[PDB]
Design a protein around this ligand. Structure first.
Ligand SMILES: *C/C=C(C)/C=C/C=C(C)/C=C/C1=C(C)CCCC1(C)C
Ligand SMILES: *C/C=C(C)/C=C/C=C(C)/C=C/C1=C(C)CCCC1(C)C
Ligand SMILES: *C/C=C(C)/C=C/C=C(C)/C=C/C1=C(C)CCCC1(C)C
Lengths: 231, 231, 231
């Protein structure tokens, strides 16, 4: 473990996901409302999956060596196996909040799958210039997702209950700001231009992951918007 | 790129998927009806996924070498990663048209997954005779899908709105004719008996893919059947 | 085939899955009730997927060599590709029986995916001590699933129709007893401590798989609980 200088951030990430999982799991024990049970299930599944993948990176399983630039570069592929499942679930948390129609949910989940899959292909691509072509395609998918979150979801949330509108507005702003940082970190880090070394990149991804999963869930699961309107 | 003689068809396929994606994406911008939004989301996701996989084949990522017959044979595995996601979506486009029940949809999607997965296993199998065992299992799954499209779906479509019945009949005939050609091309091409060389096989798959995705979508998204009956 | 002593059990498993698939496929031909069609679709898909993966193990495709303990150990990875799709479907068969809410279904399917995925990671892990860490995480996911089947599902089934309550109670007891045996067999077999040799382990998994899929389906598809209450 300790032979890699990024291990501490991996270890910290593992701890912060596991604790977060346990907290959400304890917080949803006394919940009988089926809407709230949906939100608790999705929101608790997110850091549990992230916990397993951070642990696989810490133990060395989720790492491979990819030759590009004449070098063997360490690529943590397990992130993508994380994100493939946790980014649609997070989007589902937003979409159930505003009661989105099924076609918009399918468009969001499909564009997210394209984003993560093309990011994985770009991370594993051996021709150095082609990695940025895949980065550009994935960033276009992200920009579609952010467009849908701003111009199909806010004006839908304004016509619903005021608590779900305010909670959605906060979670939307958190999501857009945090998700936009990931392609920048990928571009300047070890998967892209190699300006930022791998230990600092691992720290940055850990802060982003913990914020976008545990902090997101802390804002969501403390709101009254997850419960059905009942007496 | 240009070192492989099939590259031109890969390039053409990439172009025709991307253009098709853009056209559907522009055509669904002015759509507010939620049924039509479902059909536009599914139908636009299909050539976008196909675009990414054609690009991966063009850049050389979606190709591997499989030893059989004493030879290293070029196998484009990315097709299967395409088809695993795009063939159920296309089937979903048919199933939402006739308002199929959930069990029939689950049977169709599961049989389709078996078809694509056993095709992938047969494409990667190193023992030459076993490749045709997997081909036979996949063809049996295809024949189940075609049976369901003819004897559980046509007599359901006849009791619905006449526009959805005529549009379903056209798309069903297009789907059956185009999908039946794929196991023949696999059997006589480089994955099977090797009678047709890889560049002609790549051309044939490109014509089939463009027809079964973009032409299918052009027939579907121009019909009144995708809209709810409203004044 | 015959060079491996476990081949006979693989062959027997393949036969028993295929026959079981055919029987369910013939038994659901005369079914028009949409609830019963859902149960027949799920229950027939389970041994069909298991058939394909048993065949891949018999032909040698679903086997890889994993170095641990200074040895190259034969690991049948195809089991996990089986279980990833067939264990949620079986859970779905239970969840549709008691009309479970969507959040509970999502929690069950997600915990099941974590169980199978961490089992696969543990099966492929080259550091011998870490294999049991992944075993422990997967067993914790299994214990969550069994908790939900006993303390969120039985008291829901008691308020429904009596035939669905009795059928659910039988299938729940069968499921809990059979599913609890799998981590024990993994732990003492060739993936874990290596006390039981691979041919006996393959026999044990074949008996468990045939019981938990075909016997489960025989109990389910003979019950009146799968039909809607109609005159
Ligand atoms: C739980 C972690 C989350 C919320 C991860 C979010 C990740 C992204 C929004 C990733 C985006 C990427 C691009 C847009 C292009 C470069 C490749 C990726 C995968 C880093
Ligand atoms: C978008 C492309 C589509 C519609 C692809 C359709 C592909 C099939 C129907 C493939 C079928 C196969 C068999 C039935 C057996 C041989 C292996 C396959 C995968 C080529
Ligand atoms: C169709 C076959 C079925 C029902 C398989 C069930 C498998 C399990 C419940 C597997 C569980 C495992 C653990 C709980 C820990 C050890 C690893 C596994 C994957 C064997």
């Amino acid at each position: 473990i300790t032979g890699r200088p990024e291990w501490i951030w991996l270890a910290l990430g593992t701890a912060l996901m596991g604790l977060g999982t346990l907290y959400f799991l304890v917080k949803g024990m006394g919940v009988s409302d089926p809407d709230a049970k949906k939100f608790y299930a999705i929101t608790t599944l997110v850091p549990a999956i992230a916990f397993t993948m951070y642990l696989s990176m810490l133990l060395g399983y989720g790492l491979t060596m990819v030759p590009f630039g004449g070098e063997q570069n360490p690529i943590y592929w397990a992130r993508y196996a994380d994100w493939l499942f946790t980014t649609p679930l997070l989007l589902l948390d937003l979409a159930l909040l505003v009661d989105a129609d099924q076609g918009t949910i399918l468009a969001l989940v499909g564009a997210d799958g394209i984003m993560i899959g093309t990011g994985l292909v770009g991370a594993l691509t051996k021709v150095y210039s082609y990695r940025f072509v895949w980065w550009a395609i994935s960033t276009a998918a992200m920009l579609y997702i952010l467009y849908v979150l701003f111009f199909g979801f806010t004006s839908k949330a304004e016509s619903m209950r005021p608590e779900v509108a305010s909670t959605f507005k906060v979670l939307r702003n958190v999501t857009v700001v945090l998700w936009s940082a990931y392609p920048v970190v990928w571009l300047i880090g070890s998967e892209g231009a190699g300006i930022v070394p791998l230990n600092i990149e691992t720290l940055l991804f850990m802060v982003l992951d913990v914020s976008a999963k545990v902090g997101f869930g802390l804002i969501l699961l403390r709101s009254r918007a997850i419960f059905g309107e009942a007496e």
